[PDB]
């Protein structure tokens, strides 16, 4: 498939060159920027299970040696789908089972891959150890778990 380009009518008289030069000139390891990452992983079976790791960040350095790994939300469910607004807008899960909010996984990059790969091969153990090391109780039903709350009706 050949590359196609869409432009706002305000830039009709610009070239790619004159647009990007202007964008580059009007913009201003991180410093001093806003950056955000969304990773989506899903299976190939029907009603496929999926998960999303996401985070965003301010500006400059490690906080445990990762730039794109500044992850603070982790979500599990089924049916990854494209967001409104097109492919550029990333993904959402159609069926959301569990969402971890303010779960700082930045320090498990430099362990998150072992956790995600484990998950894909039927093994939650490394993910569970990461969660336990943050003080999360993984052996309590969600209904009794203090930091957990139920979504209204379905999402």
- Coil, helix or strand at residue 125: helix
69 binds, among ligand HEM, a copy of itself, none (CB under 5 to 8 A by kind): ligand HEM
* DSSP at 54: E
Looking at 64-72, 80-88, 94-102, 140-148, which segment touches ligand HEM (CB under 6 A)? 64-72
57 binds, among a copy of itself, ligand HEM, none (CB under 5 to 8 A by kind): none
The tokens for 84 are: 């409104």
Residue 148 makes contact with a copy of itself by CB under 8 A: yes
Which whole-number Å values give the CA distances from 34 to 31, 56, 59, 60, 70, in the listed order? 9, 7, 7, 10, 12
107 binds, among a copy of itself, ligand HEM, none (CB under 5 to 8 A by kind): none
Contact by Cβ (8 Å): 34, 5 = no
Question: What distance in Å separates the CA atoms of residue 60 and residue 70, rounded to the nearest whole number?
Answer: 12
CB of residue 19 vs a copy of itself: minimum separation in angstroms?
6
Name the residue number minimizing CB distance to ligand HEM.
69
The tokens for 105 are: 């996984």
CB of residue 23 vs ligand HEM: minimum separation in angstroms?
13
Residues that bind ligand HEM (CB under 6 A): 29-30, 39, 41, 51, 53, 66-69, 71, 109, 112-113, 116
């Amino acid at each position: 498939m050949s590359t196609t380009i869409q432009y706002n009518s305000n830039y009709a008289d610009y070239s790619i060159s004159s647009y990007l030069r202007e964008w580059a000139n009007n913009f201003g390891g991180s410093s001093t920027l806003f950056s955000g990452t969304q990773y989506a992983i899903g299976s190939s079976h029907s009603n496929p299970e999926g998960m999303i790791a996401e985070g965003d960040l301010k500006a400059s350095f490690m906080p445990q040696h990762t730039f794109h790994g500044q992850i603070d939300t982790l979500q599990f469910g089924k049916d990854l789908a494209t967001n409104a607004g097109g492919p550029s807008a990333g993904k959402h899960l159609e069926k959301i089972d569990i969402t971890f909010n303010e779960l700082d996984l930045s320090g498990e990059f430099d362990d998150m891959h072992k956790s995600v790969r484990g998950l894909m091969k039927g093994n939650p153990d490394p993910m569970l150890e990461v969660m336990k090391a943050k003080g999360i109780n993984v052996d309590t039903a969600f209904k009794d778990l203090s930091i957990a709350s139920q979504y209204p009706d379905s999402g």
